[PDB]
Structures are given as structure tokens and as C-alpha cells.
Amino acid sequence: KLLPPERMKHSIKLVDDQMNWCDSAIEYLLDQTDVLVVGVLGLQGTGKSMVMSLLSANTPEEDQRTYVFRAQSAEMKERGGNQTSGIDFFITQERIVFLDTQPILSPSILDHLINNYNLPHTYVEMQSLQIAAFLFTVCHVVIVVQDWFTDLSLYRFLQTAEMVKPSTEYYPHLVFLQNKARREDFCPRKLRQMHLMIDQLMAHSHLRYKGTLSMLQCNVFPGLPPDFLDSEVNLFLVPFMDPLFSLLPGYRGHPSFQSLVSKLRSQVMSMARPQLSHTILTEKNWFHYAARIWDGVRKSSALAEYSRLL
Amino acid sequence: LLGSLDPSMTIHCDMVITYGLDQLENCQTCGTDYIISVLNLLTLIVEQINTKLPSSFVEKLFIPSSKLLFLRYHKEKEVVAVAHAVYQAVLSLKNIPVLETAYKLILGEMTCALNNLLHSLQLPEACSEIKHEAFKNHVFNVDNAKFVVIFDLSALTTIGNAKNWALSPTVFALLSKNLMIVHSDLAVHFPAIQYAVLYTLYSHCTRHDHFISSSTVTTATKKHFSIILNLLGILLKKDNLNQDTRKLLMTWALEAAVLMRKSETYAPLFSLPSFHKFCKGLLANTLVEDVNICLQACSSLHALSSSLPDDLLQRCVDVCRVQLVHSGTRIRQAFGKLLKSIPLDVVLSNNNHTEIQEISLALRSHMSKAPSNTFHPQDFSDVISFILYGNSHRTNWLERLFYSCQRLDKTIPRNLLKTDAVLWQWAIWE
Amino acid sequence: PVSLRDLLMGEPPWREDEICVVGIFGKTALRLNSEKFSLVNTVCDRQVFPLFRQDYSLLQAYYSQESKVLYLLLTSICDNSQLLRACRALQSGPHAEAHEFWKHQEKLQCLSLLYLFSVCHILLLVHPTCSFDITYDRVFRALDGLRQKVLPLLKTAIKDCPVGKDWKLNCRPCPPRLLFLFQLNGALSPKRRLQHALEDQIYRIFRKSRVLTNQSINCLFTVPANQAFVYIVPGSQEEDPVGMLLDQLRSHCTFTLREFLWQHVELVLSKKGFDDSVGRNPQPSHFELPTYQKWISAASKLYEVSKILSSIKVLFLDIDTKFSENRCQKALPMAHSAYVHKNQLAQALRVYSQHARGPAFHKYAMQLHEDCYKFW
Ligand SMILES: Nc1ncnc2c1ncn2[C@@H]1O[C@H](COP(=O)(O)OP(=O)(O)OP(=O)(O)O)[C@@H](O)[C@H]1O
Ligand SMILES: [Mg+2]
């Protein structure tokens, strides 16, 4: 008489591709408290869907055709199109909510909207800003996935999104995930430059991008002392897919993909869960709060002010 | 035309040498094909003129002012390949007096690059016993120094992998005792140099059966196995090793262990102290987060199970006991077989187990801490359902639950998080 | 390989030779070997740039006699090499100073880009990933209008030049052709399909944003209508020399970019020019083939250039600054109508902070505090 409610096999659609709410996740929610919400953000081919799938209910040794979050297929890469649309939803058995996100400012959505405001160009930017603000106001942590280092345009977008957010202020933690890392990026000399650039580029961001999720203490660098870094921000690197002398494998210079994925998952799960509103909330209450926030963000006033400026 | 004949004459070499030098001195900003042609011509000239090349030819060929050193920086792989071929041809000479100067110049360049890296890392210089006057004052960038060191190490394989060269600094001693500073601090910021040094040393030692028969040439190599074992033990006992370096060291250790017992004539080699240090390193390198490393260590220990003292067997018993309960499957079977390979006179002994003591200490430390109040009702319901009814309703779930029950805003060792005993005790207490 | 400023000041061997100007620009990731240097070395087939070798903008020039072509490489804050130095300098030596610093850097980069867009024959944009950022569409939209406000001033300085007639009118030799270069970055014949899809997407996006028009005169740049203008550099072991050396050690212990560029260079070198107009009524496009001294005569005058700063200051962080200023101004009236006096001042400040915030809230907060203090 204490069996679990149900087990989710595949992620559902929390928000339709037309920016419409979809109330269909209450069937898998309970009345428990102390819930954790994780969101993702990134460009078109960064790999947010794969990261979310591997961090929620998947393993690297499994296949990409059975992932909880649909990933880009080989036939789709040749056409230069996107796969994830709208916002997804999935909750693991540990009562951890995972939220996916479509690419921001991606040319695929723009091209699809061409054959369908003053011009059909600021619409994509506003949709991206709306999603960023929503994830920044109803999620406990947000992970930013970057295909390459220093895009120089994501920081400005993040600051602008946080400046136009809906609303003793609450600022969720920010995580910088560098996907498809190489050996050259796994050196202390380059690490210092990376941390310095990240810290100097977000000096007045008001977000919690430091003091938590320190990969230096996760045994990634055995002999690297903590004082070697002026300010270790929350940055993590994810590498590319992976008689006796002649059988020695090649030298990669970076830890195994599975090891880093497991470490990242453990660190994400062992994170804090601060309060969102000025009251305690449960799973159902959190769902209702998120729905109300999305409804308010859609018919907001700051967005119109920013729209007349473009 | 030169290759048509054979190196068994006394043809005029001054004209050919001056022609090659003149073409090399003005081949910096040339095309991609002219450089390759010049390098090929130089290699052919060196090979054709054997034991007759004056020392001045190679003296002015391996100096900073020489353009050859600046031609290896090309992005094309063909240029680097021909440059390496030139180095191989020069180092493949049978004339000791003309080869000693080249070897000394190469060693001096390596020392200069190492000193530059040490200075840039805010550390004093070293390796002053192989320094050269030609590189007294020079500046090498971090990337340039690393590239030069790796290139020289790769070029040394010509003489290191020889099939039988009587030089003062032996290759084995140079890579095992002279370059001992790369494992102190350079192994943290520049692990590529350490990996390259270990790889070349392993490649040179594996071609001579790790110098087991010896333990002129035989008398000179009468103390090589002991040094290899000591180096392996010291390196394995460290705690600041990289994944690639650890994997290479484990492979080398496994190969050496399998070779120690191939014959029965190597029995006296089990009493020397280096063997004890090697065994200690193997025992201390297990019980890590990596699964493949643990499997390799277990296989190596199971290979030479016999010939070990009571202390090593006693420690192995505790290691097998703690590893018997693991979240994996291969680890459990491997350690089970290893334990079954130990006699009853040691498994049933009343000696104290260190691993069990550490587990108990960790549990006590966690219990003495203040309550966390993070155990959700669902976790308790699942635990109760699995204990009273047997159905857990959860598809390695203990580790996931433990990780989800922690907080970063507000300390069991990570290596002990893979054991089901600790996780079960923690869940029951929670 | 010398600086552009150090080249115009200073030729007899190639005083009059027909050449083509090729501009190189775009973003670059943090790596030892930059994409532009490798591109120049591969095209010239020689080690032009040797390996291991106030403002944050730079323009490098290099002449190739074997091919009679001039290359103009551009470096700005977009590249990681300059960004790292800027961050390091800013670390040692306020929310208002950083904004102004970034705005100045962006303005300088925009000015340099505009200068390159008027003295080059063919220009190419690089990128570290297959996907192209749509932000460029806005940058170009904010650049064309800028030249429209600077063109009358540029033609006044080059009036006494032997460039010709069309050059003095359009302030350019001929409509420059833009090329796009991307990198595989581990993605994925599929290459041909990907290139075609990218070209179609780029053409549609640029046409919708009105960046590209039927007339090849008003637009600042055009693209080929029947040839290829998008290239994807495949992965190779050239990068990270350490890895290549390790692979070599392990082994010992046990179209094309050139053609892609000549396809377009042969047209300008043959005086044929370019013709891209399918608006049902094409018109002739101006084109010229100057020499070394002839090109320098105008390049020096254009590089030496009173009113440029004033015109460039009217054009991006401008939107963010305007939004922040508007929000602060709107929030100030609410707090000004809310007010011993310490409690009232604290309440007003808290209300103002919770009402709105931006990048210039310090000025509004100070003004409100001063007004409240002076009202008692
Ligand atoms: N670290 C990685 N190493 C190798 N391949 C990867 C890696 N991450 C992602 N990929 C592959 O590259 C592509 C990235 O797309 P993916 O499905 O992961 O999500 P995405 O790029 O966020 O998608 P979307 O276009 O919806 O934003 C996929 O084909 C995936 O298999
Ligand atoms: Mg996706």
C-alpha cells in the first residue's frame, strides 16, 4: 500500500512548439516537498539533449535511439536542422525534475519561420529571451552548454535575459559546460585563462557562478593545488565520444568520457535546493507556480519595451 | 645519381657537402616541395657518405643558427617526417666521434628547453650535468619548449630501439635517472613530457626482455631490472598520476609480473627489496575509482600469487574481503578468484584488517555528525518496501540515492562509495 | 607579414602590377594556431606566418608576388587572442566603466570592419563551427547604413587620386564578394549536402533581412548565383602538434581551399569582374584592376581618415544601455513619490531597487538619494 505512483519511460512536452502551455505532467507528480529543478541552454549543435539524457536516466554505453530526450539524427545533420522543439519535461525516480530547451538563435528555426513584428528576425530573439527568463525564474539550476570556448555573444544574451526577467531577489546558479573538449583544453595553463576570462566577463552578473561545483576538488587534476587558480568558477568540461606493449591505446590527455559524465551527474544531484517564492512549495504547487509564471511572462510589459527598441 | 652507386668508394665529398650546405642555408621561405627535396638530398648524402663525414658537418647542423632546427615547425606532416628521417640517418652512423657531438648537442637542447620550462614555472633549473655551451643563453616559449622536448625524445628512438653505441650518458640512465625532475612538478603542468619519457623507456626495455637474463653488455646491464622495479614501485605509490600514465604503468607492471614467473630460474629475484616495493605499489594502487585499473592490478596480483611473504598475502586478504561486495560484476569475480587462490592458513588467521577498520571509521564519523534531515519519505518507503517485502521498485540505485541525498551548500571517501556495505549501512541509519 | 600602418608609409620591384585584395575576418577560438594564419599558409603554400610566435584591433597585410595577391587579416575583440589580453589588462588596470570599455571596443571593431569593406576585392568570414550565428545578419544591417552616412566624407579625401572615375563615385573598386568558411568540429557525399543546405539557409536569411538585394550596387556585398561560396574545412591532425608528435612516436616505436579561392580569383585577375543580378533587369557593375602604387595611393588616404567619430557615435550594447536608462528613469518616479529620515530613505531605496534595475542604476540611485536628502 506504498508502491510508487508510476515510472516515466519517455519525456513529455511541457510547452508546445507554438509557445502554448501543456498541462499533462500532473499525472506523474506527488505532494512531496524539496524538489530540484534543472534546466539547460545552448546553441544548435552543442548537445543539450544528449547531456540531459545522460544525466537523467541514461548511460553512455546505451544507444542514442532509446534516449529519454530525442537527439539529432544523422539524416538531420546533413540538412542543418534542429531536433528539439519547445520545452520538454522528465522526472527521475529521485524526484528530480529535468527541463530541456530548444536552441536559441538557431538558423533552423529562422529558416522554418521564413516560409510562414516588422521582420521575422526579432521573433526568434524574443523567444530565446522568454525561455531564458522562464528558466531563470522557475528552475533551481541552469546549465549552459557551449560548443566552442568564448562565443563572446552568450554572455551579453544572458545578461540581457536576466535584465528583462519577470521578477530579496532570487538568482539561480549558473553552470558553464564546455562540450566536445580536446586535449589542449585540459591543461592548467589554459584552465587559468578560461577561469580568468569567465570571471572578468561576468563581474556584475548577480548570478551564483562561483563557490559551487568546483571540478578541481573532483579529482580531475591530481596534483593541481587550489591556490593555483585566482577564482575557480563553476566550469566543467565534457570530452568527445570515446606482447602487451603493442596493444597500448592512444594517448588522449583527458579523462574518460564515462568518468567525467558520472562525476558531473553526481555533482549536479548533490547540489543545493534553495526556496523559490516566499513560501514552501510541493511538486504540484511548483507546477502551478511555473504555469502562472509562464502565463505572466507571455503577456509581460518589459518584453514590449524591449520590442519597440528593435 | 648518387644513389645509383654504392658507399664503397672515395668520391669527392667536399663539393657535395658545400652544395648541400649552400642550398640549406637559403631554404627558409621556400615552397612545400623544395624543402622536402632539400631534406631528402641531405638524408641521401649522409647515408651515402658513411664514416667519412667530418665532425664540422654535423657540428654546424645541430646549432641554433642552423636552419634545419627551424624547418621542423612546418604544419605539413611530410616536412616533419623528412626532418625525423634526417635525424635518424645522422644518429644511425657507425662513427662514434662524429655521433658523440650530435648526441651532446641534442641533449643540450633538451636541457635548455627543460630549464626554460622550469624557469617559466617559477622553479630552479636542473640537469646541469648534460648542459652544452652552444645553448648557454637562449629563450624557448612554453609551446616551443614542449615541442622541442617531444621531438628530441622521439628522435632518440633511433638509438634507443637499436638491435645491437657506447656513449657516456646511457639512454636507459638518461630516461631513468637524468630526467627525474619531470615526475616531481612537471608531471602536473606538462604531463605529455612525462608520458613520452615513460613510453620511450618502456619501448626500449620491452625489446630486451626487461633485462632479466643479465640479472661486456651483460656485465654493463647487471643492475637494470632492480632499477626498473624500483622506478615502477615509486611511480605507482604516488597519488598525483594521470589516467594515461597510470594505465601505461599498470600495463608495464602486468607484463613484468607475467614475465617474472614464466621460468623457474627467476626464483631468487623474489628476495630483493625492489620486488617488495613493487608489490607494495601494486597493492596500494588498487581500490581506486577506475575499474579497469583495479582489474589489471587484481590480474597482476593473481598471476604471481605464490612466492609472497605473509604480510603481502595478509593485505591481499583484506583487499579481497572489502572488494567482495562491489556494485560491479567483473570486480567481484576477479577478487573472488584471487581470494580463492590464497591458502587457508592466511584467510583464517586472526590478524587485523585495515580496510574494515577504515570502513568502520568512516561510518562512525558519519554517524557522529549532526542530522541532515534530507531523507525524503519516498526513499524511506522504498527502503522499507525492499526490506519487509523485497520489492524496491527501483531499477546501482544506492549510489544514486546517496548522491541525491547530499548538499553542496552545507564526507565519506569517494573510493568507498562503490561498496554496497557502506551504502546499505548509510541507508539504514538515515 | 607586416602591419598595415607600417606598410602604407613605405615597392620599385612591383611598382605597377595587377593585384587582387583579399580580406580575412571572423571569430577564432582559443588555440595556439589561429585559423587565419593557417589559411594564409595553406593558400600561399609557404610558411608565411612562422609557428610559435589602449586599443585591441589590428590589421596585417601580406603581399604574394608568386600569385600577385594582397591579403588583409583583421584581428579584434572577437578573436580570443585579443580578448584574453583585454581581460588580463582589465583584471589589474565599476558597472559603468566596463560598459563604456566594451562599447568603445565594439565601435573600434565596427570601424575597422567598415574600412575593410571598402578597400577589398574579395573578403571571407571564418567560423569555428558548422552553424553560423544569425547575429551577423544584424551586424551587417547596422554596417551598411553606417557607410551611407560616411560615404560623402570618404569620397572627399580620395578626390585627388588616380584610382579612376567609378572608384571616386562608389568609394570602392567593385562590389566585394563575401565567402563563408566553417569547420567540421567533429560533426558527421554528406559534405556536399551540408554545404548546399548551408548556402540555401544563408541566402534565404540574408534575402529576408533585406541585406542582399537584386541590384549589385546599393548592397555592400553579394554572393555567387551559380558557383560555390561556402567551404567546410575537414578535421586533420595538423592542429595540436603535440598529438601529431606523439602519434609519430607511437608509429616509430612499433574541391580544395586553394581551388575554392582561385575559382573566384581568376575572374578578377582576368578583368572580367563580377555579375550578380537576377532582378529581371540586370545592370552593368563597376569594376577596376589597380596596381600596387595605384591601390596604395587610395588606401593611405582612406586609412588616414574629423567627422568620422561623430558619425560612428550615433550607431550592440546601445540597446541594452537605452533599456537600462529607461528602466531606471521609470523606477525613479515611483520612489520619488514614496517619501528619522533614515527609515524613509531606506524604504524608498528598497522600493526603487525592487521596482527596476539595469546597467546604469547607480546614477539613478544617487540622484534619488540626493533629491530625497535635499527635501528635508
Ligand atoms: N560530446 C559529444 N561527443 C560526440 N558527439 C556528440 C557529443 N555531444 C553531442 N554529440 C552529437 O552531436 C549532435 C548534437 O545534437 P544533440 O542531439 O546532442 O543535441 P543538440 O545539439 O542540443 O540539439 P538541438 O539541435 O535540438 O539543439 C548529436 O548527433 C550527438 O550525437
Ligand atoms: Mg536537442
Residue numbers in the entry:
A (entry chain C): 170 to 285, 293 to 343, 361 to 435, 452 to 519
B (entry chain A): 463 to 626, 632 to 682, 698 to 877, 881 to 895, 900 to 919
C (entry chain B): 4 to 13, 39 to 81, 133 to 172, 181 to 275, 295 to 360, 408 to 458, 476 to 485, 488 to 511, ...
Show passages lifted from the paper.
The PI3K-related kinase (PIKK) SMG1 monitors the progression of metazoan nonsense-mediated mRNA decay (NMD) by phosphorylating the RNA helicase UPF1. SMG1 is a member of the phosphatidylinositol-3-kinase-related kinase (PIKK) family, which also includes the ATM, ATR, DNA-PKc, and mTOR kinases. Despite the confounding name reflecting a possible evolutionary origin with a lipid kinase, and in retrospect the ability of some PIKK family members to bind inositol-6-phosphate, all active PIKKs are Ser-Thr protein kinases. These large, multidomain enzymes share an overall similar architecture: a C-terminal catalytic module (comprising the so-called FAT, kinase, and FATC domains) and an N-terminal α-solenoid (that typically serves as a protein-protein interaction module). SMG8 and SMG9 form an unusual G-domain heterodimer.
To understand the molecular basis for the SMG1i mode of action, we reconstituted purified wild-type SMG1-8-9 with an excess of SMG1i and subjected the sample to single-particle cryo-EM analysis. The resulting reconstruction reached an overall resolution of 3.1 Å, and we observed clear density for the SMG1 inhibitor bound to the kinase active site. Superposition with our previously published AMPPNP- and substrate-bound model revealed that SMG1i exploits essentially the same binding site as the ATP analog. However, SMG1i wedges deeper in between the N- and C-lobe of the kinase domain and is engaged in more extensive interactions. These observations identify SMG1i as a potent ATP-competitive inhibitor. In the reconstruction of the SMG1i-bound SMG1-8-9 complex, we observed additional density near the end of the kinase domain, protruding from the position where the insertion domain is expected to start. While the lower resolution for this part of the map was not sufficient to unambiguously build an atomic model, this density clearly docks at the substrate-binding site of the kinase domain. Superposition with the previous cryo-EM structure of SMG1-8-9 complex bound to a UPF1 peptide revealed that the additional density in the current reconstruction is mutually exclusive with the position of a bound substrate. We concluded that the SMG1 insertion domain contains a PRD that can directly occupy and block the substrate-binding path in the kinase active site, analogous to other PIKKs. The SMG1 PRD would have to re-arrange upon substrate binding, as observed in the case of the inactive-to-active transition of DNA-PK.
